[PDB]
Design a protein around this nucleic acid. Sequence first.
DNA 1: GGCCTGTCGGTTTGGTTGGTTCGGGGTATGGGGTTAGCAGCGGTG
DNA 2: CACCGCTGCTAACCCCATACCCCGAACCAACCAAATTAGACAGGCC
Lengths: 288, 192, 1011
Amino acid sequence: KRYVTDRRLAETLAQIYLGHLLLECNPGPGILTQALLEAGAKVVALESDKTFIPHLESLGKNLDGKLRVIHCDFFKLDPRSGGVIKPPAMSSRGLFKNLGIEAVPWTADIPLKVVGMFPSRGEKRALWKLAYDLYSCTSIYKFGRIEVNMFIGEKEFQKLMADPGNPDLYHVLSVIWQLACEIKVLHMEPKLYLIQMIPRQNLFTKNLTPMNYNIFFHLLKHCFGRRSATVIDHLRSLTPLDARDILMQIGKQEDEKVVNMHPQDFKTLFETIERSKDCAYKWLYDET
Amino acid sequence: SSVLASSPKKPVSSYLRFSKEQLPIFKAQNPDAKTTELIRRIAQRWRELPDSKKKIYQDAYRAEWQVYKEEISRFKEQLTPSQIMSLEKEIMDKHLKRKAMTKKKELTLLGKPKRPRSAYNVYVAERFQEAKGDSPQEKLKTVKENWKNLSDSEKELYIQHAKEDETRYHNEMKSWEEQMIEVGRKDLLRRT
Amino acid sequence: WAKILEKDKRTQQMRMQRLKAKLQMQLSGQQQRLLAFFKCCLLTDQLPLAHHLLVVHHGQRQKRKLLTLDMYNAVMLGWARQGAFKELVYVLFMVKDAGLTPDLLSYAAALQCMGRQDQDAGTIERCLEQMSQEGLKLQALFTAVLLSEEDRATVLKAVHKVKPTFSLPPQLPPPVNTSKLLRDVYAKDGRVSYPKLHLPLKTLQCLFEKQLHMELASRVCVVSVEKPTLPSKEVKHARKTLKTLRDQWEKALCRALRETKNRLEREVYEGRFSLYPFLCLLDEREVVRMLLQVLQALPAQGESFTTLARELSARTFSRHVVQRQRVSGQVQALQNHYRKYLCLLASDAEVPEPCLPRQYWEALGAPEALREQPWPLPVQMELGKLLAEMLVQATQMPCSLDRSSRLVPVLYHVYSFRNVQQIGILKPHPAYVQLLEKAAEPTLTFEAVDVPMLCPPLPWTSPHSGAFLLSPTKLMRTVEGATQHQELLETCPPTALHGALDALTQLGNCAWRVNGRVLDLVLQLFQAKGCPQLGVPAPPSEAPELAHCQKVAREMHSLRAEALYRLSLAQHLRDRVFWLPHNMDFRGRTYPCPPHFNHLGSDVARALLEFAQGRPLGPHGLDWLKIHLVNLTGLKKREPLRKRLAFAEEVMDDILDSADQPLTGRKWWMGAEEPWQTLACCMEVANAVRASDPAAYVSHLPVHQDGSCNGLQHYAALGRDSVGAASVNLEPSDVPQDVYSGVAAQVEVFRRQDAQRGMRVAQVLEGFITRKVVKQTVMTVVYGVTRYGGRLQIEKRLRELSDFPQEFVWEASHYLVRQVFKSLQEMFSGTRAIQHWLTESARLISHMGSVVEWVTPLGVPVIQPYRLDSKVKQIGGSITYTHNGDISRKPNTRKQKNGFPPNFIHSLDSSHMMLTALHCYRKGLTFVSVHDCYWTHAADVSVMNQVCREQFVRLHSEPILQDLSRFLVKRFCSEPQKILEASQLKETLQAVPKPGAFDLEQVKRSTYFFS
DNA sequence: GGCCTGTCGGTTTGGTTGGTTCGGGGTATGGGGTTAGCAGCGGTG
DNA sequence: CACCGCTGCTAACCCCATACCCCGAACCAACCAAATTAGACAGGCC
């Protein structure tokens, strides 16, 4: 995997995160962990490889304070459609309960901060999993708007930050995450980008709730199935409502292209369709 | 207000350049020869021209094609945000219009037998020449007035010939439509 | 005026000149498309079209190469059938112009054109002597060339003009199979007593006419069982709206069809291929009615676009075959031939000599009408996409549902991304669904091929002739490797397959009838309130956080649908006698063709059916009915037969009470293991005991005798394993030997060791190892290793154990399977030797890039179809559905090695069942087979057991392992290079495990071998 | 041979590659073909 | 029952076209790539 082995980078990162409780993912050799501890941070290390735990714990015994080492693979927490039968896999409810972390309302401020590095070959997977958890208000996001700082590859970074201004990289994860969190570049390590993802307080609305996000995901995947087609073409296969009428409601012309739609344009589209009043039904979603 | 007119056009190819430069000379030396023959002899001149000479025109065409690449790229970049949309609109309209014009010229080229001539048409054909009037419209109104003043007996020959042309049109329509069936164009037959 | 008239005339003549000027001016997917296009054009008689396309392709440098001699032969045969001598000569000119060599089909087409046109004996003679100089054979033409009866007639008329004494080979003397095991089945030496049906000749002809009419219509209208009543206004309005909408869809579909045929027609006027003639193959009204039927039957949830295309293609091909036979006179010849065939089955009719249905059928004729090869897969796919897209585009409906100016498409295709690969789904408008729900249509429609036949099916004479009279039916179900298995079925000697064909024909000849009472009760529960405890689905009213409720609701709706169809067909067949034609899989296992209603269904399905022809109980009929009853109850599984009979005598009062008042009495039957079958057996036993003479009661209820773990029986027979023979009741015993109990004990000791080691699954499975769990588990490992069709069922049986943590049900099922494997291999070391021998041999054979092939002891060749990596995709404007062509690149070694032993065992049990069926048929017994179960009348249970044991001993008495070893050695150890892999392969094949001491003859005395 | 890694009608869409046909590019004056005006009517929806 | 457009005719004026070659665009058959994610044995690579 990826491990922070440079002391200087560990110090810079420590000062950045210090800028509350810190959850460090896959500390490995513990360079960043030791940098944080020396900087005065209260650290909970979630180590997926048990071989790194001893030395880490040693560092804790050097400080003998509130540092805590847990044998846990953060990217395996709360497996979807799983039986909960693994040591590295755990439940965020039980872990946070042991760590004394209490849930706070969505409108409340950031209760906790998680930092780490995406897997070198699991960036898309992790982004999708975290997206499901966030939009579903499950996992860590059951406790509030968790701030997530993660190292990511340059390709997935550019694709994630893309938009109609750079259509070739614009995609579903771009829309979902740009609508979900305010992403900011905190550091660039050659290239790896440390991205900060903070959920937006105003993500959920009267018509966009954790109860209907599945329909929106279905709409996004459906539209991006044929990215070259027109938005109305896809809408004719997504809702019984007048597609031209809806697009006009969102202030777009009939010739509007999918790649020309901004994330907020998609959001206003979905909320507009859910808002429709004089129809026996609004969606055509029927999938397992 | 025509974007198509200001759009950079393709450079002339080698042969077309040679003809574009030779044509005025052949026209000066043969002022009375038809353009057909001059273009033919110019094409023969091009065929007889050594490849080493054609190479010059080809190189010139290639440079003109590079400058055309730059120009067309810059023009495409210059248009408003919907530049691709406007290009699609103008190109689509151009193609549809071109196909339409081709189809109209096709339908005009065909040779369907003339419809039956009415007694009024026959009377106009027989009396227009001798009808007084300063223009075709005035002579046609004159023929119309004299026709409206005609009695039932004076019209017997015109009506008879009109009927005869009805039978003629009938037969010719039968045979011609049959031949169109041979050509596999039963859509041109009378509907019922 | 002659000036103007003459001007018009002159311009007309010039226009005529202008008109004169205008008149002056290695298989492949595309090749398959073109060839299929020409062959298709022969059927629609659109010869000018195909000739035009062929000429265009020939005239183009790059296109001429795409043409094939077979195509030129196609067009040439078309012209010969039309008598266009000049055009045929032109095609021959193209053939010579493009080099290549004319063939027997070419000269046959020429002879057809000359005969039809009655050319001179000089030209005919010259053609025959040019054919002689070319080296071609006169007699090879009539044998190697596929020609219609009209082509044959015309060619014969041409030949009889020069050689009037020219005679085809003397035919048709059929050869008898000399197989070791079938010799006594086909040998005339022996007293045969083939049974006859209870219906008279005229009755069988009336039923044959009803079936023929049903297949000709291709549709079957059955009355819905239940919920006819509904609010008076709602159903009325919804029905009126649905009728109007259906008329609009009918008209719009006709118009769209004609416009599409025109479009494709113009596309053929252009140099492009199109499915025009295929759309001109079937009547437009039939096409519209078919599409409207599919629309009416489309499931509310939707159907896969590709799957729908396949279905449309299949029904199109079927209706096209039906039409061709209808207009080609094959129908009348089938009427006469079948009307003569009915003499063998009819009660009031006799035949000259006794024979099997297939023998008599081939003896009467046997022209067998004509065989039509299906279309290439790309044509089927393109046609399906065309029909589907046309239906979607043409079908429109207003969105207002319950002032409907707006129009929206009735069908809309959406996408499912559950699979990482987006898949096209066709979904109907929800307003349409609600409309059909409110309308509550009281009629259901089925395909003629999905319902039982109203007359005895057609005897299986070849791998392409069988099942329904007109509709073509494949001899082997397996679609994967259909080309390989079919081509090998046709490659093997025709006599080799005689056994299988006669067995399937026998199975199909079994007369069935419906049990009125059982149907009345099952409906009574279904009509009002379902009974899940008795396998009767409950209506949606009984559906029960929201996610689980929706899941349970969906499952209940599925079961409700299936039961609706099955019980509906049952009600339609209430007062009728019907037959179920059977088919085979690649393993040889037989399965009924009609899937909805058949004896292979659930308990209710098995209880709804009974033998149409009765059989007097006799001296042991009543005893066998009572013993069978106890077997169905499952209360005395371990008890001997005598104690089961005594128990029946004990609970006789509960049997009579249950029979008289099933739902109002003591309801004892509801407690049985098989409640509906137990109840039926109680009614039968009541009718028997209450009759004046029980020994003379004509009993119709079939009795079952099942082989416990038939696979383990076969393995114990192969290795002569004494421990196995005793465990699986091969060795005679007065009490039944339960191998599930012993295996449960050994697995219990292993579970004690692992649980002693601290394992969680072993600790949670304590006290759950039971006969049923280990019964289904062993039934799995034997017949199934991987491919979790049954493993999911075992997971179900564990999920029905309330006191078990469902979190380990998956891991617990895997662990249970592994422990059953280990245990069986421990207590049956010899069995492990045989299994490892076969598995390893298959591994090595597949490792050389060749699939495992063998031959059953009955002469049936079996080939494993597991292959991978074949794909090609079309694109209709615009989904791009993929397709798996039949060209395989490499075998799947894993599936081959894991599957060889189980498949071989399947071939063994299938061969045994077939032998038992044939020999039991010689004695006049009614025989049907469900998986391992053998059924017969109570009057003949003993005889059936006799034939069963005799045929088992005879089967395993031969050196099955030795013959298989030598077979694989000869077939796969012949490659000259490399010889090393053939030396190790031979080394493993010749390592046949030594058999045990067990004496197979003891099976003849084992009472509980099959019980 | 030894070690490491992937797995238990692959889906539809669309991107590149090897080929082959199709047409836009240049033109000139001479020939055709053209709306206007008024009435009549075969043909079509 | 209504609506079209073609004849009858002219008029001077308006409007497209065969001889030719060059190469850029563009339409088929085929192969391939992407999107996506949560413990044993056999195959592939060094």
